Design a protein around this ligand. Structure first.
Ligand SMILES: O=N[O-]
Ligand SMILES: O=N[O-]
Ligand SMILES: O=N[O-]
Ligand SMILES: O=N[O-]
Ligand SMILES: O=N[O-]
Ligand SMILES: O=N[O-]
Ligand SMILES: O=N[O-]
Ligand SMILES: O=N[O-]
Ligand SMILES: O=N[O-]
Ligand SMILES: O=N[O-]
Ligand SMILES: O=N[O-]
Ligand SMILES: O=N[O-]
Ligand SMILES: O=N[O-]
Ligand SMILES: O=N[O-]
Ligand SMILES: O=N[O-]
Ligand SMILES: [Cu+2]
Ligand SMILES: [Cu+2]
Ligand SMILES: [Cu+2]
Ligand SMILES: [Cu+2]
Ligand SMILES: [Cu+2]
Ligand SMILES: [Cu+2]
Lengths: 332, 332, 332
């Protein structure tokens, strides 16, 4: 009887940050209430000023990370305001039935809907838009995110002992297929609808024009670099709704990795690079041991350094010469 | 001494169906006899009427699934009738030695051969044609299938308890590279031999023109949708002989997945999406919990919804509102 | 106190061979000293005589495999002689901090540097060049290799029992992106610097022109085929610094596979084909059971047989008819 369960309302935050939550559940099962508003907006995705018509959940690419516990109910109010132009919906890979909820959430502009589902399996999972006949166009326009379903007793290592993270970040990786004219210049449209047949032809090449973290080339750099301190335990959730990716922390490792994101499985240890298949979310746990700048990339290095799939951590603290040292600095 | 072993003759059925077999072996080791006839035929692969010259085992793409138990002998009579034009052979990834049998099975039109091999390792494995100098052309013309080698005591979960399936389907996923003229229209040839140098150039782009389940866009839909009932336990075997794939059941999960198909390993649990590397067969076990239409796709959504890698399940039974429900239907 | 530790100097050998080492450590922790010299050279990569300007560690593509034990220190003297034209450095995925050492090893021509790092995690790992702003160009010009960090008590199976290899080979797989003119012919340049903007445009297609083992089409064939004997236990280390690969031994299996290369994890058993994500090294252990020629390929068969990712083993010994036999040889 759901009506006897506590209801909690959560306000979502913008990626790469994650809304406040408890790792080990401090209550019994709850109905966890989220609201998301769909926003179609123009987005500048690179340093050259290339613009697309992005389709978003809550104004960001990716959509925000939702965090619940195993056997909570998720109740999502989904709003499509009348300033949008397209029909949208939502499919949760965490959920069971009705095309992940996609069959029950089709909202024209000016409509809203409320879906509830039980979070029966622990893990990180992708959610994304999936309207009949226009699935890849919506997804590769940025209409995807993830949800983390924590076990009620939090995360465990390969021997079943607790793993507690100090910080958590969400990296959404987006493949874009910007249409190009004959000479290779990117095209521009006034509405999303205008772009449709060009977008399909661009997708059909299977060759993205941009691959980015958090919606743009250089989004996780400079003043927007991820931060940590030496000795901190950091969980990085990474999703790709459409295309394989192979994350790698330059200068570090994935101490404990759930590459396909499902926490009833033991983690893989000591990973250099791991594969997150398209349509999956994964999670990697690392404890920082050295200060400095680290780069977090897709380790297809062309995708990283030419197409944009690279961000930075800035880590503060004490240098440990036992782990690495320059014996003779570069010299003639 | 093989001559003292029982011999059983099996008649194969067309994918996605699988020939009758026992999960737990009810006899000791046997010689299991199969016959396959090679058929080169014209195949229409999409709704536009694009035709290729397909090269098949037993008239289908994929070839039929063969099922034996660990430490059975497989004896295959392979027939290349004189109505075909090409030399063919067979390589079993389940087998040991002679290029998986490819070195011993080279048959010109008008020839036949009988190979025997011992099935020493449990798992699902790919088989495919592999003639010297023309390997990828034969494979990507549809000349591949799979064989399942069950452990003698059937399948086990991660804790070694029995997993029994009620139904089993075989999904063969095929990447085609149809040659194109200057403007982008698909070419047509009278014989397979005519297409050869154009086929190579098309393969070299590494970009398929079509990716399909069971030989055509829409083959596993409509009256050809896969069926199940709520409460049924379904094993889906999925092979890709040449290119990576990332299957996903929309609205469900892979409860127990052997993504690289080898049953001495524990399954991965609770998968949303899994990676089957090209040249591999994998297997996923799911118990249906909700009725309705489900889509089974490659979760590169362009490959699924534009290039054709999508099929349907139709599941009958009772709706469970506790798992999912529409709280407020779409409305203004 | 490092100054009290034994120092051992190792001379590296050319791939696919590996320098002499002990599987089970016969001493305590040591400082293991390696020297590598950077060589920029012209390389002929295919049977047509296509030439590139390769950037190498120690004159080979890949760079040599380095072998140490867990909790050894690696001290690398890296030399960039004044006959080279570019700035280079080295990033070890085995190491912790400073961008894997890349931040501390930037050497102009005429310079050298000595880096030391502690090998804290057991596994095979990629190393590669990674100069600021030119990372993928250096890597896809062949400037990568691997390092194996053995556990102090050698390798273990899934039940923790010793696995001892009789032989070890290193296969480095290289994706090249040779620029092409309008008609599709490969271009030629006098210096590496000349090629730069054409190289970027070629990389951006995400479509390699060649994928090769040990630096050239056909490098691991003929008199350069890998050898073994029936009954021998062979470890094959396989690295790909930039792009996914799916190795497969035609006629055999991966008995024990660490597909992502990290030895604290149990191996996957009985693999037909496995996925090594780009930016990773993996390792596969096989015991040969049949004599003959075997092909070791990337099982995207186009990448193998058209683009060049294929080599051979030649195995000597006795044929076992129980495992495979031709019952009726090909005949009318
Ligand atoms: O500004 N809407 O794409
Ligand atoms: O956007 N209508 O609630
Ligand atoms: O699905 N492409 O990695
Ligand atoms: O191929 N996926 O980056
Ligand atoms: O999907 N297990 O990480
Ligand atoms: O009809 N034979 O391709
Ligand atoms: O096709 N000859 O048996
Ligand atoms: O081998 N291509 O996924
Ligand atoms: O890249 N394989 O779909
Ligand atoms: O290959 N083991 O699923
Ligand atoms: O010959 N140096 O590229
Ligand atoms: O190349 N200078 O040591
Ligand atoms: O990163 N390409 O497999
Ligand atoms: O897609 N990697 O071969
Ligand atoms: O990464 N473990 O094979
Ligand atoms: Cu949408
Ligand atoms: Cu999906
Ligand atoms: Cu054939
Ligand atoms: Cu094969
Ligand atoms: Cu370099
Ligand atoms: Cu790297």
């Amino acid at each position: 009887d759901i009506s006897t369960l506590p209801r909690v309302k959560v306000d979502l935050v913008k990626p790469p940050f994650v809304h406040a939550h408890d790792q080990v559940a401090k209550t019994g099962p709850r109905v966890v209430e989220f609201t998301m508003t769909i926003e179609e907006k123009k987005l500048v995705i690179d340093r050259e000023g290339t613009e697309i018509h992005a389709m978003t959940f809550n104004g960001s690419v990716p959509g925000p990370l939702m965090v619940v516990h195993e056997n909570d109910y998720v109740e999502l109010r989904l709003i499509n305001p009348d300033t949008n132009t397209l029909l949208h919906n939502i499919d949760f890979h965490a959920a069971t039935g009705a095309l992940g909820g996609g069959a029950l959430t089709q909202v024209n502009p000016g409509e809203e809907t409320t879906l509830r589902f039980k979070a029966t399996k622990p893990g990180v999972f992708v959610y994304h838009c999936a309207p009949e006949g226009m699935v890849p166009w919506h997804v590769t326009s940025g209409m995807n995110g993830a949800i983390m379903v924590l076990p009620r007793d939090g995360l465990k290592d390969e021997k079943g002992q607790p793993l507690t993270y100090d910080k958590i970040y969400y990296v959404g990786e987006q493949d874009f297929y910007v249409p190009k004219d004959e000479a290779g210049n990117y095209k521009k449209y006034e509405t999303p609808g205008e772009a449709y047949e060009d977008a399909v032809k661009a997708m059909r090449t299977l060759t993205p024009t941009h691959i980015v973290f958090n919606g743009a080339v250089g989004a996780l750099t400079g003043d927007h670099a991820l931060t940590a301190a030496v000795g901190e335990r950091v969980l990085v959730v990474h999703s790709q709704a459409n295309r394989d990716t192979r994350p790698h922390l330059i200068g570090g490792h994935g101490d404990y990795v759930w590459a396909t994101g499902k926490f009833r499985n033991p983690p893989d240890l000591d990973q250099e690079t791991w594969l997150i298949p398209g349509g999956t979310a994964g999670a990697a746990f690392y404890t920082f041991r050295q200060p400095g700048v680290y780069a977090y990339v897709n380790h297809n290095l062309i995708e990283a350094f030419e197409l944009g799939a690279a961000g930075h951590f800035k880590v503060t603290g004490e240098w440990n010469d036992d782990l690495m040292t320059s014996v003779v600095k570069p010299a003639s």
